[PDB]
């Protein structure tokens, strides 16, 4: 049974830690969402094939460009994440995350993940962006970004509702197998 190392990267606003906790844990949204997700390892089944899935968070490292790559060696697949309700985080995919990942890991598959899908139709969120002359990131725009950066797959999800969450990690595994 092969081992898979998956590293989650993206801006601080993206909810990387929430995504990981929601995926790995039962009854996710508790009274308190933890700041720390320790390196996780478990056997997962994808298409009737067992794999040992390793997950590493990078939360807290967003401002330290020489510390981040310390986590990159031997990575089998990256999740590059942006929030569907943060155009800033989306722009940093092409401007920050893709260049960095590709520099250190020329041949490692990338899954592009749009997080906070539950907020995309939230009136208050849309209005807050509108005040900054901004709009939530649409599916076509996300798809376009994925093709632009050569991601193996583009996927949208919500840590909160867990919609699309399982598929993110299934597809990360399939990108390696």
């Amino acid at each position: 049974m092969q081992a898979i190392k998956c590293v989650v990267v993206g801006d601080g606003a993206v909810g990387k830690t929430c995504l990981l906790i929601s995926y790995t844990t039962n009854a996710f949204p508790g009274e308190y969402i933890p700041t720390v997700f320790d390196n996780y390892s478990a056997n997962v089944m994808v298409d009737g094939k067992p794999v040992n899935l390793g997950l590493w968070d990078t939360a807290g490292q967003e401002d330290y460009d020489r510390l981040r790559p310390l986590s990159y060696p031997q990575t089998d697949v990256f999740l590059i994440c942006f929030s569907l309700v943060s155009p800033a985080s989306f722009e940093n995919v092409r401007a920050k995350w893709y260049p960095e990942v590709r520099h250190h890991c020329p041949n490692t598959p990338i899954i592009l993940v749009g997080t906070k899908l539950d907020l995309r139709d939230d009136k208050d969120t849309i209005e807050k962006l509108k005040e900054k002359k901004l709009t939530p990131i649409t599916y076509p725009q996300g798809l376009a970004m994925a093709k632009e950066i050569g991601a193996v797959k583009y996927l949208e999800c919500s840590a909160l509702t867990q919609r699309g969450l399982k598929t993110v990690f299934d597809e990360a595994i399939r990108a390696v197998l």
Binding site: E31, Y32, T35, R66
Partner: protein, 279 residues
């Protein structure tokens, strides 16, 4: 206040888990190298100091001093910032750890083969050696997030939280700055205050160093030293003509361009700090 209890519990429990993690790593992977029965690859034999860096120094600090200090503030979350301030000096050991990390990794992937993976299997360990070895890097980067969360559920004029936060943003900044400094080629003396690329700069207490990012003939990416200036010439300009920030008897010859407005603000403040210091 309930929020405060959750944050403090997380800080303490993750500190305990971190200490346990370091102890596990040293009990297993390290012990096998120094005292184990199985053959050790020739390329890693007697090189445990490269592989594990100063992990033992880090463990001793947290186990003997820092965890005990945190547990003392267990029900005084407003005042836990003081702990980080008091022990600021000790966290410098993380600069050492981070600087050594690339060497550890290289030695593992090139010379260890499956030696550590076999130990992992034998000990029934969930964490690989690489998983343990990244933990200090993750930890030194998590403190500031926990202190930020505390800061938000406290009010202005009561804490020392902010002072603790300042320290814990400074430590990974200094580790990161040091990694950049090691890439400088073609170039004591003074403390490194800022580094960033402009149109790569290293601002020390009494020197200002200009570099250019290039690649070696070996393909290794580094900063080629180009020029240097001493503490004198300052030029304060923030605006251009609908563009990012550009700054410098004086002439127009001196041009420096920062990416964002916030980054521009830093350098101005920090250069001026060591202009009055040298005079």
């Amino acid at each position: 206040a309930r929020r405060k209890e959750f944050i403090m519990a997380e800080l303490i429990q993750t500190e305990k888990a971190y200490v346990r993690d370091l102890r596990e790593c040293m009990d297993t992977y390290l012990w096998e190298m120094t005292s184990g029965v199985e053959e050790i690859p020739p390329g890693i034999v007697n090189k445990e100091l490269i592989i594990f860096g100063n992990m033992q120094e880090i463990y001793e600090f947290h186990n003997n001093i820092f965890l005990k200090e945190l547990e003392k503030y267990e029900q005084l979350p407003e005042d836990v910032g003081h702990c980080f301030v008091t022990w600021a000096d000790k966290f410098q050991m993380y600069v050492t750890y981070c600087k050594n990390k690339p060497d550890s990794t290289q030695l593992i992937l090139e010379h260890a083969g499956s030696y550590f993976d076999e130990i992992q299997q034998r000990h029934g360990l969930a964490n690989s050696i690489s998983s343990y070895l990244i933990k200090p890097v993750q930890r030194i980067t998590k403190y500031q997030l926990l202190l930020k969360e505390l800061l938000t559920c406290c009010e202005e004029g009561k804490g020392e939280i902010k002072d603790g936060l300042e320290v814990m943003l400074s430590v990974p900044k200094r580790a990161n700055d040091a990694m950049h400094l090691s890439m400088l080629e073609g170039f004591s003396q003074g403390e490194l205050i800022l580094q960033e690329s402009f149109q790569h700069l290293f601002l020390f207490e009494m020197s200002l160093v200009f570099s250019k990012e290039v690649k070696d003939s070996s393909g290794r990416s580094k900063y080629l030293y180009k020029s240097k200036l001493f503490t004198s010439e300052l030029g304060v300009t923030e605006h251009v003509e609908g563009d990012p920030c550009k700054f410098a008897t004086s002439d127009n010859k001196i041009v420096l361009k920062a990416s964002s407005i916030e980054n521009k603000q830093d350098w101005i403040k920090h250069i001026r700090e060591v202009i009055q210091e040298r005079t």
